[PDB]
Design a binder for this molecule. Structure first.
Ligand SMILES: C[S@@+](CC[C@H](N)C(=O)[O-])C[C@H]1O[C@@H](n2cnc3c(N)ncnc32)[C@H](O)[C@@H]1O
Length: 256
């Protein structure tokens, strides 16, 4: 039984009250107040459509993934990753795909900087999509479940699905459950082949063990995963630490 499975265990034992306090204890989060109010009023410039823009920004600003050329954004949802990438100088095209329907967030149309190189497509299950030529492959798919065996299946399926889209390109791929032994085996094989490293984003909630496989880095995957399991387990032991609040991203207007 992995450290991660013990964390998962404990998480599942929490009351809703305890869960709600635990999930943000000591994390970082952006202040969405202004964006939500603006989106509520139909504003199409400046605002990120989700917390995802700031989440991907954290990786990009640290050069862990450097979006360039034609960017594919797998499970776009509202489009946070896509609209962010749209403003980056090296990026020439952004194609986002997402399931949508009941479920499942629909793309939100925006006119933030670079919106003209963006096409977001709903009604698209990426497990049935053939791979396309791209210079950057982004994927933020992986639905949490109380069952770590369900999550293991979802995670492995994502890893197998994204591989053909990796063509010596930049990438950032969510790994929903990185602690199950079989997932580690796949990750180790993929890292041998395509390189990169697994990284914990500080904007991730404590309610998920997700880490991101990014292209620009190196390191020991097992050590990084266990570090996260120890972090998340430690956060069970103390009174709720209020999250570190940061400014949300401002995404423009205009064409590129
Ligand atoms: C964590 S959200 C992405 C948030 C996005 N990165 C943003 O910045 O707003 C993952 C998205 O994947 C979508 N999704 C889940 N399974 C999918 C599938 N099989 N094919 C396409 N999209 C999927 C979900 O509907 C959800 O909108």
């Amino acid at each position: 039984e992995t450290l991660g499975e013990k964390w998962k265990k404990k998480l599942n034992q929490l009351s809703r009250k305890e869960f709600d306090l635990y999930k943000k204890s000591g994390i970082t989060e952006v202040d969405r107040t202004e964006a939500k109010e603006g989106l509520k009023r139909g504003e199409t410039t400046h605002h990120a459509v989700s917390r995802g823009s700031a989440k991907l920004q954290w990786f990009v600003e640290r050069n862990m993934v450097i979006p360039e050329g034609r960017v594919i954004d797998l499970g776009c949802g509202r489009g946070g990753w896509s609209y962010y990438c749209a403003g980056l100088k090296k990026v020439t095209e952004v194609r986002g795909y997402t399931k949508g329907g009941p479920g499942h967030e629909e793309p939100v149309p925006m006119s933030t900087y670079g919106w003209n190189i963006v096409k977001l497509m709903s009604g698209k299950d990426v497990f049935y999509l053939p791979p396309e030529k791209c210079d950057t492959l982004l994927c933020d798919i992986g639905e949490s479940s109380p069952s770590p065996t369900v999550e293991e299946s979802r995670t492995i399926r994502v890893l197998k699905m994204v591989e053909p889209w990796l063509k010596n390109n930049q990438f950032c791929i969510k790994v929903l459950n990185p602690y199950m032994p079989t997932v580690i085996e796949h990750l180790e094989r993929l890292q041998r082949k395509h390189g990169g490293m697994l990284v914990r984003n500080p904007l991730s909630r404590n309610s998920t063990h997700e880490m991101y496989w990014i292209s620009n880095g190196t390191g020991n995957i097992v050590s990084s995963v266990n570090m996260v399991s120890r972090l998340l387990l430690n956060r069970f032991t103390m009174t709720h630490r209020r999250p570190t609040i940061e400014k949300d991203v401002d995404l423009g207007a205009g064409t590129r």
